[PDB]
Amino acid sequence: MLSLRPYEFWFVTGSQHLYGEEALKQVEEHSRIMVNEWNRDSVFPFPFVFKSVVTTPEEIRRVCLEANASEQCAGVVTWMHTFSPAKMWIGGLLELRKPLLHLHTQFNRDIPWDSIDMDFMNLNQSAHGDREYGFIGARMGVARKVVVGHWEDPEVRERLAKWMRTAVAFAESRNLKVARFGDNMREVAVTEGDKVGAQIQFGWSVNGYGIGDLVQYIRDVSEQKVNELLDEYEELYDIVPAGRQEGPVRESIREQARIELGLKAFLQDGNFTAFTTTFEDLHGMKQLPGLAVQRLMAEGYGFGGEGDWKTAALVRLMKVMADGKGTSFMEDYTYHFEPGNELILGAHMLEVCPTIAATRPRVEVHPLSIGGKEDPARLVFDGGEGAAVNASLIDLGHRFRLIVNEVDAVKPEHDMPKLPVARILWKPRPSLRDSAEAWILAGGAHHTCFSFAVTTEQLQDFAEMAGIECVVINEHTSVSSFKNELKWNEVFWRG
Amino acid sequence: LSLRPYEFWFVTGSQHLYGEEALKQVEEHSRIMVNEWNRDSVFPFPFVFKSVVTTPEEIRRVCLEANASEQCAGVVTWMHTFSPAKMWIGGLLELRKPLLHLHTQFNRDIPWDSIDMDFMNLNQSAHGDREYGFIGARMGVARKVVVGHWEDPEVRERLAKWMRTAVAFAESRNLKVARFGDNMREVAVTEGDKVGAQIQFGWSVNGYGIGDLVQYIRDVSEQKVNELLDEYEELYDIVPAGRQEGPVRESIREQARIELGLKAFLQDGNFTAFTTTFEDLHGMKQLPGLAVQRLMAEGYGFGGEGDWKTAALVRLMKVMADGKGTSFMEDYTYHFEPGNELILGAHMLEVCPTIAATRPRVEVHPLSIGGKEDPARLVFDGGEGAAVNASLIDLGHRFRLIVNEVDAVKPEHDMPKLPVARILWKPRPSLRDSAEAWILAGGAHHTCFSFAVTTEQLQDFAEMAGIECVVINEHTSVSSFKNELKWNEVFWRG
Amino acid sequence: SLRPYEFWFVTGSQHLYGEEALKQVEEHSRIMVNEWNRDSVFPFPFVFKSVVTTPEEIRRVCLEANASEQCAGVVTWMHTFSPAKMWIGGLLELRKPLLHLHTQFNRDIPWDSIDMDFMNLNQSAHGDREYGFIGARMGVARKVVVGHWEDPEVRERLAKWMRTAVAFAESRNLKVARFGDNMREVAVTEGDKVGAQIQFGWSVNGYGIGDLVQYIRDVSEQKVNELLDEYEELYDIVPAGRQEGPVRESIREQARIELGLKAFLQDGNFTAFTTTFEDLHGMKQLPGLAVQRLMAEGYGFGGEGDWKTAALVRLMKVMADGKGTSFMEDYTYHFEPGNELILGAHMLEVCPTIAATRPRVEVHPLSIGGKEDPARLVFDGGEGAAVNASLIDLGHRFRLIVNEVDAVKPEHDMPKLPVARILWKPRPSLRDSAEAWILAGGAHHTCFSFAVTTEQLQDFAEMAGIECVVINEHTSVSSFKNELKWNEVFWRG
């Protein structure tokens, strides 16, 4: 499983000098108390770090600068404990490139009726401090998340926690290194795009390597590690009978083990956390990578087929973002149009991640004429069931668009014994008919990232951080409204 | 404060085509409508019959005349018959007075057994007002549209509300604001472009040294100070100590002196709104407290710490208000108790007693902010009921009006230690959602709170003035409001 | 009064050619920095930064540049091909002024020996073009300079740019104290301080005149007396000013004002300020002599609450090489055919650094403001090529307007004129400059300077992201009108 560096979140509290140093002592006490308490709550997947109360232009600017330079700082949560005149914040906000969350909160929950006096009013006035702050944010057009509520409210904490995962995905995005073995599948439009534009927009480093580079790593893999990995297959998966005995079928599987170790070595050496292949460029390869790619995805690598670096990037980010397991490369393959039981069968010619499997994966070998190589080994299974998202990040030329459809994956009511690939069935919201229409209106790709764990809110928060359109298709979606929103979003996102 | 008499010009459109006799009937109808409208006490200002126009010369002239007439607060136009709209272009180009298109009809019902060609030629607002509607759209003219029979009570109430709004707009274009001192240092939301605002709303905003006001206070007759103090004891409950010749009374007397110096200065230069700033009180004995509260009660606009936008907004809203209860206001602290979320609003001193549920109480207490003597002020609880809380901000290249609908509630508990007037309110549709939407819109901490101004009125003002207005209320969804802000921004740039 | 600002020389290369080649790259860049730092044309020093060749190295040095208060600018050069996607991360991060120097270590092609190793080494010819693309592609604010690194003209362009960049550093940290508001009803000096703070860095805040009165009250009389003595050393005095009597006491009061202002300004780190004759409660005189001396010291000043000009006067003073920079206001014209000119002055506040003659301390009545007869330096402004500049607020954005002028020595004395003044012939003529200036909405308040060039002001605008328009010898009014229009749509948003 791919490891993230330790990330943390900086809690920055604004006030001013006007009220006195004692008032400021109490502001610092309050913010230290909230940071300690939050960090005792297991709801948070990363820790908060307390930062000295900021009360001057230079205190604010310096902590924003420090937030930029710290590789461990994944995000900044800002809260005005008192009025904190926002011209002081301009400098800081200009320097800050780290994800920004404005928490509009209050130390105490209730008003202490019998004792509330003027010092109290001078102290617990987020009711207006955050609004003066809220204005400079709006006036400057800063990318921000706004969260309102009491700091002990578990619902407030839950959305801070989701946001943390999202911001951490953003940090990984900023440092993402993608390796392509070969180019886009020829004549294909949706997988194409502008890598320079994407690096500017998201930070992704996307670069191409000849398949020959990978072949060399596969050749240097030790035969004993191949054997140990093959043993490891026999314990995690069901192997087709023919593959449990010496011969051609077992060899195919051993060859996917060799491909896995080769990919791992190439990837780790370059610090890549996502990659692409293309069946159209497989010189020196025995097989299209299949089982091998499925296993790497289960370890958390991003992947896109046919040189699809956008989806490969998205799969990795969404894996980072996910608060659970079950995130895979995905493609819509065929439809079931039965009235009252409309669903979508999703798969890829080989590469579906076992993390979405309901059942225990079977290693199988089957012919594949696409790519013209030997019968590839792959994991075969039925995807699980439950609420999910299926998302696509496309390139409209001048800008990017992130498109997400909320879906309900369903348990197959029938076996599919002649079907050589892993697969999943889902019912897209609000209906097959409407969702597919809205998707085509938005020009969503056929390649997506499917996840049982990423929420719609996370993807939108990510889109906000990155400065891109995010369009969502779910229960409440009307096709005609959706159509208008694309037009209205159009004009707004130009520039 | 008192308004000059304002009136509303009813202009009726028709054409020569159907003959002179037809035109006499059109005129007879409009005279009947105006005379009967004026008998209806729902209208706060009179209508004036301003002829039936049928030529571009007649239309242009009435529009010129309307601009030049200080009495004329608005023009109501109605096409009784087809009145070809190229004739109206020149007039609509000239017109700078607020415009209401009344889409109406003289008879309520179709007289089935008698309706004939003369009748069809005569009562054809059905298409008259549409052709006129095209030219208004085509020209991007600022306007209010109202549809309905002229005797319908709902039509008349919409008309009545718009009148108040048009009148405030007239006061807007003549507003004088006096600033005693500059903005509070380092504050962003109260800053903004005065030249832009003068162009956009008509507001004159100019700064005076606090010294100029001190001079006026210094020249206040002590005989008048004493009589004003009598009125306080007559109107308010004084703290027991303030009723005997001690130092508590002297503090109340100083506020009285400040009230009179403020009035003298403000009337001298015809100001109807003003700001102070606690960062500049040289030559002053107290931060203007009680005094400001009174001037607000008389309909003055006021803004704390140099806030001229809110000061203006408060005067404008007092003018368009159909009732009592409009104040400068600032959200101070939250009550986050699940199921009873509310906001406590107040200022450090300046809250208008016109929103008070209880008889105001003159108290004196220390206030460290400003470094001056303990100020006298009126203390009370805010009343209950539906209200709006509004803010107007400067985004740099344009202005944005933000209004939250709220429900003010009676406090369930006394606040003994609290030395300022206050009010509690629950924001729609929830405290969490309104605060989020408000922050998304960049709404100020300083607002104008009122029990008597409606969202329709504020929206109509924004229309009259060519600025965005966004409303947060029961039906507001936050994610929709984010989009509404995005899409509006693209429309309003340029 | 400045500080040790410095400029970071960042050199790009790549791992492609091996380590030896990279060592040579590094050795060239250290030499270049050493040699530049041994050339007096440069008003500030360069700093060597180790040759960057990876995305993390580039991003790191940009993060560092941003955090360093002494770093006034980054100078980037691609010694070899240095694949520009590596530079995207750092360029997004960098908020310091950026100059792209397009140069080459060796001046000539060594014909008889040039081989593949030399072609891989000295390939700025294409390294800087690839870097040029990413800059244009991302829309970064930048200055481009082309030529050999030992070419004296390249060095002068680099040096001029250094002063501009330092002005911009000062701008990002500038504080303006306003004693009182804008002169009532005036439009051009109004504006949006929040927008100015976002765009330029300027902090502009208001103090009651009372706060300055208090500082003036707190000044010790020994220092007043010392200062009064300095006036006697530096200026000619009205004879009546030499001995005791009310004229002497008028001058004494300006010293007292100057020392009050100085202490207020130093306590708060204000390097520019404004006053308004419309608010002088507690003062005895409108600040006059006092203001002129503070401008001579390097402070920005603006009359009638004019912060934008106050800031501009300070900024231009910083970027200037030499004395002769002042707050200024067009006062009256000489329309004599063939000898058309403008008399610029202010009611008291003209800076003595533009003086041709020794300033004289004089006391004259002044009814504007309703206070006592103010003491001021009086003199005739010098002659020579200069610029007159205004910064205005169009509502949605700021516009810098610059007229190149030729200051001239007055042919006649002006015995009855109680203020310091200066005469000038604006280019390309009074008729044309005045018209273009009005078409552009130029303020009447300006910063006048003998020492600032047009290119500098254009480079500052470039750094700050605002329009700059120039009126000079080549200006056609009708082309200028078009330019305003075409610039208009470019700058919107």
Curated annotation (Swiss-Prot), chain B:
**What reaction(s) does this enzyme catalyze?**
beta-L-arabinopyranose = L-ribulose
For activity, the cofactor(s) needed are: Mn(2+)
The pathway noted for it is: Carbohydrate degradation; L-arabinose degradation via L-ribulose; D-xylulose 5-phosphate from L-arabinose (bacterial route): step 1/3
The record's comment on cofactor binding reads: Binds 1 Mn(2+) ion per subunit.
Question: What Pfam families does this protein's entry cite?
Answer: AraA_central (PF24856), AraA_N (PF02610), Arabinose_Iso_C (PF11762)
Q: Can you name a GO cellular component term?
A: cytosol
Instruction: Keyword check for Ribosomal protein, yes or no.
Output: no
Q: Looking at its record, which EC class is this enzyme?
A: isomerase
> Under what name is this protein listed?
L-arabinose isomerase
Organism, by scientific name, is Geobacillus kaustophilus (strain HTA426)
Primary gene name: araA
Curated annotation (Swiss-Prot), chain C:
What does the cofactor section's free text say about binding? Binds 1 Mn(2+) ion per subunit.
Q: Which UniProt keywords apply?
A: Arabinose catabolism, Carbohydrate metabolism, Isomerase, Manganese, Metal-binding
Query: What does the entry list as the binding residues for Mn(2+)?
Result: 304, 329, 346, 445
**EC number(s) in its UniProt entry?**
5.3.1.4
Query: Is Isomerase tagged as a keyword?
Result: yes
> Catalysed reaction(s)?
beta-L-arabinopyranose = L-ribulose
Note the SUPFAM superfamilies from the entry.
Answer: FucI/AraA C-terminal domain-like (SSF50443), FucI/AraA N-terminal and middle domains (SSF53743)
Per its UniProt record, what CDD domains does this chain match? L-arabinose_isomerase
> Which terms does the record give in the GO molecular function aspect?
L-arabinose isomerase activity; manganese ion binding
Q: Which cofactor does it need?
A: Mn(2+)
Does Isomerase show up as a keyword for this record? yes
Q: Name one GO cellular component term.
A: cytosol
User: Highest taxon of the source?
Assistant: Bacteria
Q: What InterPro entries does the record point to? A: Ara_Isoase_C, AraA_central, AraA_N, AraA_N_sf, Fuc/Ara_isomerase_C, Fucose_isomerase_N/cen_sf, Lara_isomerase
Q: Biological process GO annotation list?
A: L-arabinose catabolic process to xylulose 5-phosphate
Q: Where are the disulfide bridges?
A: none
Q: What does this protein do?
A: Catalyzes the conversion of L-arabinose to L-ribulose.
> What's the protein here called?
L-arabinose isomerase
Lineage of origin: Bacteria, Bacillati, Bacillota, Bacilli, Bacillales
Q: What gene makes this protein?
A: araA
